Amino acid sequence: FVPFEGIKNDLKGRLMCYKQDWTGGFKAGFRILAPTTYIFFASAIPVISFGEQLERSTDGVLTAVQTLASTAICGMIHSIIGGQPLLILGVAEPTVIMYTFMFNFAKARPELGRDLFLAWSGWVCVWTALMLFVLAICGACSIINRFTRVAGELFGLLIAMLFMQQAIKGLVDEFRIPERENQKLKEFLPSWRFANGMFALVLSFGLLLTGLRSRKARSWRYGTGWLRSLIADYGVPLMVLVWTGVSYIPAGDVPKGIPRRLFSPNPWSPGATVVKEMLDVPIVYIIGAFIPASMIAVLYYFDHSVASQLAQQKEFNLRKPSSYHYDLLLLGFLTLMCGLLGVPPSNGVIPQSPMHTKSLATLKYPVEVKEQRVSNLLQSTMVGGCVAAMPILKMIPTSVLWGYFAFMAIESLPGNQFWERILLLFTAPSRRFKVLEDYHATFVETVPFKTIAMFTLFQTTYLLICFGLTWIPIAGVMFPLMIMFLIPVRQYLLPRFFKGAHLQDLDAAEYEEAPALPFNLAAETEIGSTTSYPGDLEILDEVMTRSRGEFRHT
């Protein structure tokens, strides 16, 4: 923990491969565009959704323009002078939540008001930048190995709950009159409002289901290989386009605002730095900005490091070193810059960074990764240029973005062991052999069910407490502290209540999986020892055709 040692080591390591980082990207030629486009589409749409969320939550002060600008600028700067170019930067949901809390606080205090919200946010960002500078200089990133699975999975599930909550919020509001819209317009009559709500439901559910189906296109037996890969890679943008086109079908027989589209304004229109107002903020609020700044700093310290770790998995066989400390220092600088510019800060995002690394990976028949700084720069520049295309983006209905919120919420589940343990907890005792009949985690076999249930119950109680805390108007800005507390809890308290190898299996740094077992071997296990024989109708369901009731002979 010697000051500046980590930064110096990271700079020394990354300075011997800079020219190579650029030349290798240039040597790839036009073939570097496919990963670039894939990651650009993976990054832009969630940023636009977060921008719309902020527009609804900040009374129009912050919109998709600011989120896109922050993402683009931070990504380009990180690509040019950052340590780990594989890391993808963008505006994340926790930042949106914290800024919503800050806006709610500012609006209720006349001394600040809506006019000084951005200035107070800039002071908050200054404090956060100082905190990140201190953390990077003191080598606090040397203990990221303690960011274990429990905290990461709990945070992921919490963000999934927030995503689904926002989706429900938006769909409900689609049935209502917007707060800052002319109430006398024809589109806001009860009949047209009801029609807009139902159309929003249709579009959102179509987007969600079609994207979920498209995610597994490469396993299909239909079409060409290139078409299957294209669908599996770009189903989200493709489905967004398809459902926008669907939304435009009745355009001629309905008012202008049916269905509702993005509220974010076009910056090109004449109607449309905050350091000048930062001076007008009272000193008391400048000092008090330390409070949310610490929470934002904790959030960034966790998320940046976790995303970089995931992007730098040993299975990728990366030949270049890591830059955790210098990356955190640069994140502090970027947060300061974004706070001064009046845009929300950006940080490492998941699963965008590992997806980028995967897109840059090939198998030599054994993983080889094309690591360079060109793809990140190009995708950030495209995200920035999307601002110039705001008129085109404004054609997207908001219901599609709410459906995308639900899509991310559901897509956070698959690889999450906490979710799987919850499902096992709510699984019937007599049907756990079904769990053993497919791919399953190793702790299912190597740990008793009672210990798993107890661990899952503790984790679920913690998660629900944090989610409820998020609902408190002011104290809800403190949930990063609860997330951080899981480190010392796991390190000290859990070993008292849990026996070693059990914690190691339930809190393993590696995702361990086991193959499906035969029915005979699934009953000798303790967990599957209570198997129950199938009923007559259950048996007949499988041996008879549903179309005509024909007996199947095998």
Ligand X SMILES: CCCCCCCC/C=C\CCCCCCCC(=O)O[C@@H](COC(=O)CCCCCCCCCCCCCCC)COP(=O)([O-])OCC[N+](C)(C)C
Q: Which residues bind ligand X (CB under 6 A)?
A: 1, 44-45, 101-102, 105, 131, 134-135, 138, 140, 143, 161, 164-165, 168-169, 172-173, 210, 219-223, 226, 237-238, 240-242, 244-246, 248-249, 251-252, 284-285, 288, 291-292, 294, 297-298, 301, 386, 392, 395-396, 423, 426, 434, 474-475, 477-478, 484
Q: Which is nearer to ligand X, 81 or 423 (CB)?
A: 423
Partner from a copy of itself, ligand X, none binding residue 44, C-beta < 5-8 Å depending on class:
ligand X
Which residue bears the tokens 């599930």?
157
Partner from ligand X, a copy of itself, none binding residue 462, C-beta < 5-8 Å depending on class:
none
The answer to whether residues 244 and 396 touch, using CB atoms and an 8 Å cutoff, is yes
259 preceded by a cis bond (ω within 30 of 0): yes
- The residue of the chain with the least Cβ separation from ligand X equals 288
Q: Which is nearer to ligand X, 158 or 318 (CB)?
A: 158
Q: Which is nearer to ligand X, 247 or 353 (CB)?
A: 247
Number of other CB atoms surrounding residue 63 within 10 Å: 21
**302/124 Cα distance (integer angstroms):** 18
Partner from ligand X, a copy of itself, none binding residue 208, C-beta < 5-8 Å depending on class:
none
Q: Which is nearer to ligand X, 38 or 285 (CB)?
A: 285
Q: Which is nearer to ligand X, 17 or 286 (CB)?
A: 286
Separation of CA 256 from chain center: 33
Shortest spacing between CB 411 and a copy of itself, in angstroms: 6
Separation of CA 483 from chain center: 16
| Biggest alpha carbon–alpha carbon distance for the chain | 83
Partner from a copy of itself, ligand X, none binding residue 248, C-beta < 5-8 Å depending on class:
ligand X
351 preceded by a cis bond (ω within 30 of 0): yes
Shortest spacing between CB 362 and ligand X, in angstroms: 17
Shortest spacing between CB 72 and a copy of itself, in angstroms: 23
**288/393 Cα distance (integer angstroms):** 38
Where is 8: in which H helix or E strand? helix 5-15
Shortest spacing between CB 201 and a copy of itself, in angstroms: 6
Partner from a copy of itself, ligand X, none binding residue 537, C-beta < 5-8 Å depending on class:
a copy of itself
Burial class (CB in 10 A: 0-12, 13-18, 19+), 371: buried
Which residue bears the tokens 């990354």?
14
Partner from a copy of itself, ligand X, none binding residue 269, C-beta < 5-8 Å depending on class:
none
Shortest spacing between CB 66 and ligand X, in angstroms: 16
Identify any residues that bridge with 261 across adjacent strands, giving them in sequence order.
397
Burial class (CB in 10 A: 0-12, 13-18, 19+), 69: buried
Where is 284: in which H helix or E strand? helix 283-288
Tokens of 88: 């993808």
Partner from ligand X, a copy of itself, none binding residue 544, C-beta < 5-8 Å depending on class:
a copy of itself
Q: Which is nearer to ligand X, 100 or 320 (CB)?
A: 100
**459/154 Cα distance (integer angstroms):** 7
Partner from a copy of itself, ligand X, none binding residue 539, C-beta < 5-8 Å depending on class:
a copy of itself
Shortest spacing between CB 453 and a copy of itself, in angstroms: 16
Shortest spacing between CB 501 and ligand X, in angstroms: 26
Q: Which is nearer to a copy of itself, 107 or 358 (CB)?
A: 358
Shortest spacing between CB 204 and a copy of itself, in angstroms: 11
**59/69 Cα distance (integer angstroms):** 19
Q: What is the DSSP letter of 89?
A: E
**Residue 548 phi, psi (nearest 5):** -135, 5
Shortest spacing between CB 288 and ligand X, in angstroms: 2
Partner from a copy of itself, ligand X, none binding residue 159, C-beta < 5-8 Å depending on class:
none
Shortest spacing between CB 1 and ligand X, in angstroms: 4
Tokens of 446: 């190597």
Q: Which is nearer to ligand X, 391 or 495 (CB)?
A: 391
**Residue 527 phi, psi (nearest 5):** -65, -40
